[PDB]
């Protein structure tokens, strides 16, 4: 078995899936739905890889010849992953293996790095993905309740994924490229639980806003992200369901102001409508900050999933943005909403739901993009 | 066999479907979807009624203890319908009979009239439905695309229907009555092919606006509604697909004023603004409309069977009519999109799309109304 | 001004007639469910001139155009001329069939639907040519009993049957395939669900229309022997059985034709009496004697299981039996999907959504049988 | 802390253990595809210590969570220490079921999987009583062969088999039922499908697991006569047929045990050698007997399909010949839907949405059969 490592593989025979900064060696996989695609002959491959992690521990999935294998928890130290073996030595594979657990912003252990390949075969041009699409998402887009029964309620890894996810479906269809920035409970605005801090807009312009404390930082997710390196031909934003959510929770008191934060309900029930307006300019100020570093990409809200309450919010955002802007190229689509045959765990969008948005999305794209 | 005139049933058993005016004997049925629905004991029903037209002939459906069971063209003259014979005569069987043509704006003579039943067994009460749902639309609406193969593209009636239609799949669905208020390739401000007449809001607020001329002012159709003989609990508006089109089409000379008229696009291949805010205000008008005579409704534009383009202009109206009205009981959701697999004929919603959008349509209705 | 063409006047290449027919052209008698004409004509308007009568029974047909429903409705007795199009494009061809809905009835001697001529303004074409053919034998399943009609309906009555909605039709339509049907509803291939062991489908399948008795359908050449050097299907589909286990768990039947009562008994533990198999066992092999006798390179297959698939082994002892003496290369069982709770129709009988399942299936299979790709 | 508790000192109220066991209960050796352990536990953490070995055809595993699919692996020789899970909410029950993704290998000696204990926070609880029992008989369709992989692919290894992508697993989670796994793939009723007369099902049916041979199974109990008393099914689901078929159409096989070639016929015409036939009948026949022999009580319900029907006729013979002649009222026919090309999986085999259409069918048929609605 040779080893290779992973910056040693000449970029036509490797494709890096998620957005990388500086360092290379080893590779930092910072996202869920990151990680690494080659196409090997030879009868066996090794992954080497190291994790670290505390309450929450690393899953990674598996995929050879564009079809899912397996799925694991990975605890911490250095490992060496058999990814096939036994295998016709003549025969190429495609082998496809990404980190399941989204970034995850309050934990400062946590990660992810790809070493090198160890292989008896040779590695072979990869497909060529020109088409790119960033997703930017909640717990959704990190596929939250896309494992699990019904009933499960803890908020621990194995019950997230990219595995089974309507992004990664979406992408998979349309045979394109993809980045994942997502963060469970966050919102365009607020979370759910009215943290005016747990907002996208605030951590999208890093490598990878969501990985802090030293350690991340050592590895460049705090570094600004290189847009002009990976340039989408559509983001897709499902955001607004925590933004929602956070009228009918209780106030949330910031350890780092000493202030407490409330979305209101009047005694009408109806939305404080300047609260509505909170959502509606962090959505002016997101698609402009999206606008700036993507010069060229189709804007798709996309939203739905898990109720639609927010879309006249939504649009009134979009629409203030565009006319002052003259944006020709932001857009609205509704997302269909998960029924009760469709739930997975945590009351989320089960693997279904996920077919089911990425169907429509997928329809979607090919007449807005003419990818047909 | 007994005759019982239509008007000399009593209420508690007849449902009149559709929306009516001062004539009640007999009984003119002037919309899509409106017709009648008895439960009778006996072995036989006939009901006696009379159509007339010249190209564009009547169509109706029969559907006995909620299943599809006939469907046929009705030339001019009076009629005998057999709507079932030889049956156990002790059990009540609950018999619905409905128009499957749209009214038709420039067809003066086309009128389909209930006169009454012949009968050997007795009326007994109907099912009563508190819930009411109004939906107003164009050819989706009017089921245009319904029937037919593929590759059928003649404009005429055999096509249409309320019997698979989405409308009617979600008023059965949710135990509603409905009234159906629709016409092909008109829109809120203007028709596909820019005729600015062929709008429905100019027509909304008669007894059945389009049915004009001599003979239908004579039926009552061209007087003003009774809106609080029948207060729906929802308002179903899907509207907009043909004044996007318009922008696409041809300028179209007005015979009225002998003006020409076009929605215009830029060079850009973009909209033109000023054109799309004509459509932006028709629609805060329209709204205003809806909300005086119906002053408890649940206003809802559910758009996109076939395309969403028009998303951002419908949402634009919808919240500059909300914001200015201090309505909140406007909402904005969007219908799933008809793919290569489910047209119909006339490159319209077949069975399947209308079936999809039902699904869609129906989940989001028990949610807002707590319809559970 | 529209031309009209008598039927028979309209030469074999611009008329697919569906169904068996007899000696009669003028008019032409429709004597089974899925029976009927197709025609592909241009101009603005068509109709049918036809004959129909009947008592209890009306008439049911409904309306194809290009290959997609259009309408169905009830016919009582008279002269008709029915609409089947009106005011369309002139220039351009369409597709017509329109066909009988009700299954032939062996009981009603005044029930008939005769096709006289077509009014038209535009020109007849060229028909397509169906190489395929196909030949169903059944019971009520095969008349599309239940196939209309809401779940609670229980009324033996003309409006819930149906070849429109129906797993023998949507099977010969996917297929590109002319068929027959040859069906009533409650027979067996040995006895009727009562024990009435005159109600078996092989002693009316020789005949033109062996359904259709009485003075009127023996003028209409209903009781002549069919000609079936003139019709050889590439398949036969036989799907009986369903009444004859039935049968086990029902009352004894006075037979008034001999005075003799009839009883398939089952033994004290609930199983079959052995003998009472071994009937239905004769009967079959019987029956894919006499389908072999007229279909000598037909490939039968019996399709059975839409109400349950309790004979399966009845059937494939009746099947193996019949084949290991006769050498018979050519006859096989093919299992269909029972019908769930959430698939049926009226009557408890198959509903659209069971029929579409089962053509499914039974389409896979054919396709794979006879090289159909 | 974590307590460690060995397999064999969990009282049989808090574990069920899947699959067919011998005399080795410490610690427990694991034989068949689907067996493993199914216990109920508090806590935040809970981990299996367990041993493999494995040359060329590693070992792969499966992890359910309140019946819900979690994750699955390889697993390499050597002692392993699996985390089945942690970080969970300390007071509430989880119910965890890990099972062996691969079949027995027949012709492996070295690979084995064999349960030690668990490290555990929490306590275990009563485990589900399964009154109900299902034992399948198979080929490489109940290995589920081809359940997981791209549709191309074509290497002869354990990461495209399991029994969490499974029609026979999804057969017995529908209806809550106890199942064990018995499958070789290549393997038929009479002969595998490359003529080897060897490699038959029957022959291993018997022992503990026969399909696990050498010194080191032998050890484990694995030759030693299973106990069949101790577990008795309700149905026994046989699904066998497809690779006898194959046979008749692959080359003649030098058997390396006795020195003779073996070959199925087919005839210059295109069909089945007869006598060829008859010892597939034959098999049948002895087959069921030791079916009978060792459960008196339970359904046998031959079970056909995923993979063509085309031995229908001669399998239903060998149900009817062994029926007859051993007035046994307890054995059945029942057709699996047969494969469409939309739903492959890996190896030209049934892919999951087949599995899952042909659970949907024989838990229909289950249901009404057993009266389990
Ligand atoms: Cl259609």
Same mark, same amino acid.
């Given at each position: ?19 990388? %900064? ?20 030879? !009868? ?7 994790? *670290? ?8 999935? =598996?995929?050879?010849?564009?079809? +899912? ?8 130290? /250095?490992?060496?992953?058999? =990814?096939?073996?036994?295998? /016709? ?22 990660? #992810? $790095?790809?070493?090198? +390949? ?26 939250? %309740?896309?494992?699990?029964? +019904? ?22 269809? =349309?045979?394109? *490229?993809? @980045? ?29 806003? $969501? ?14 992200? *290189? ?58 100020? +997101? #698609?402009?900050? #999206?606008?700036? @570093? ?7 809200? !996309?939203?739905?999933?898990?109720? !639609?309450?927010?879309? =006249?919010?939504?649009?009134? %955002? ?22 009760? /045959?469709?739930? &997975? !765990? @945590? ?6 739901? @996920? ?14 993009? &003419?990818?047909?």
């Amino acid at each position: 078995l040779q080893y290779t490592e992973i910056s040693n593989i000449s970029s036509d025979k490797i494709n890096i899936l998620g957005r990388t %900064g500086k360092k290379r060696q080893p590779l930092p996989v910072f996202f869920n739905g990151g990680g690494v695609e080659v196409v090997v002959t030879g !009868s066996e491959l090794w992954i080497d890889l190291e994790t *670290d992690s505390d309450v929450n521990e690393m899953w990674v999935a =598996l995929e050879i010849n564009g079809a +899912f294998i397996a799925r694991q928890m990975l605890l911490p130290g /250095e490992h060496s992953l058999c =990814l096939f073996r036994s295998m /016709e030595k003549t025969t190429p594979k495609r082998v496809r293996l990404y980190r399941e657990l989204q970034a995850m912003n309050d934990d400062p252990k946590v990660k #992810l $790095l790809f070493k090198g +390949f160890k292989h008896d075969g040779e590695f072979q041009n990869v497909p060529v993905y020109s088409r790119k699409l960033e997703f930017i998402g909640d717990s959704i887009t990190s596929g939250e %309740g896309s494992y699990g029964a +019904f009933d499960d309620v803890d908020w621990i890894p194995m019950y997230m994924s990219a595995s089974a996810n309507y992004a990664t479906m979406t992408a998979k269809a =349309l045979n394109a *490229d993809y @980045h994942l920035v997502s963060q469970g409970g966050w919102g365009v605005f607020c979370g759910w639980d009215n943290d005016v801090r747990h907002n996208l807009p605030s951590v999208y312009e890093k490598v990878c806003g $969501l990985a802090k404390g030293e350690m991340n930082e050592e590895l460049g997710a705090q570094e600004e992200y *290189d847009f002009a390196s990976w340039q989408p031909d559509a983001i897709i934003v499902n955001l607004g369901t925590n933004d929602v959510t956070s009228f009918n929770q209780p106030e949330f008191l910031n350890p780092d102001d000493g202030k407490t934060y409330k979305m209101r309900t009047n005694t009408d029930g109806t939305r404080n409508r300047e609260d509505e307006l909170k959502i509606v300019s962090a959505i002016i100020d +997101f #698609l402009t900050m #999206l606008r700036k @570093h993507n010069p060229n990409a189709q804007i798709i809200w !996309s939203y739905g999933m898990l109720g !639609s309450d927010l879309n =006249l919010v939504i649009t009134e %955002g979009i629409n203030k943005y565009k006319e002052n802007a003259g944006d020709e190229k932001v857009s609205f689509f509704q997302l269909p909403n998960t029924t009760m /045959e469709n739930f &997975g !765990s @945590h009351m989320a969008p089960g693997p279904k739901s @996920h077919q089911n948005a990425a169907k429509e999305l997928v329809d979607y794209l090919r007449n807005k993009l &003419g990818w047909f």
